[PDB]
Structure 1
Amino acid sequence: MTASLSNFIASLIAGGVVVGVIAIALIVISKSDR
């Protein structure tokens, strides 16, 4: 568990949150706009 590994896993989480916010936005609209 070096600095590089921590940064790598944190980057994985950043990718996760980006995909998650895109999906949340899609779900909100798609539903409120059948």
Structure 2
Amino acid sequence: MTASLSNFIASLIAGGVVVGVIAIALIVISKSDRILR
């Protein structure tokens, strides 16, 4: 609700999408590059 508290939760959301776009890209490519049995 302050300047410092509102900016921190926005960084927490921004810290979620940085983990997110790495994770979402990693699941999709792990489907295509599976190893033959």
Question: TM-score band (shorter)?
Answer: 0.7 to 0.9
CA offset at residue 17 of structure 1?
0.5
Aligned identity (percent) is 100
- Give the number of the structure whose residues are more often helix, by fraction: 1
The structure number with the bigger radius of gyration is 2
Q: Displaced runs of 4+ in structure 1, greater than 3 A? A: none
Structure 1: runs of 5 or more not aligned: none
* C-alpha separation in 2, matches of 1:8 and 1:25: 26
In the alignment, structure 2 segments of 5+ residues that lack a partner are none
How big is the alpha-carbon RMSD for the aligned residues of Structure 1 and Structure 2?
1.6
- Tell me the TM-score normalized by structure 1: 0.87
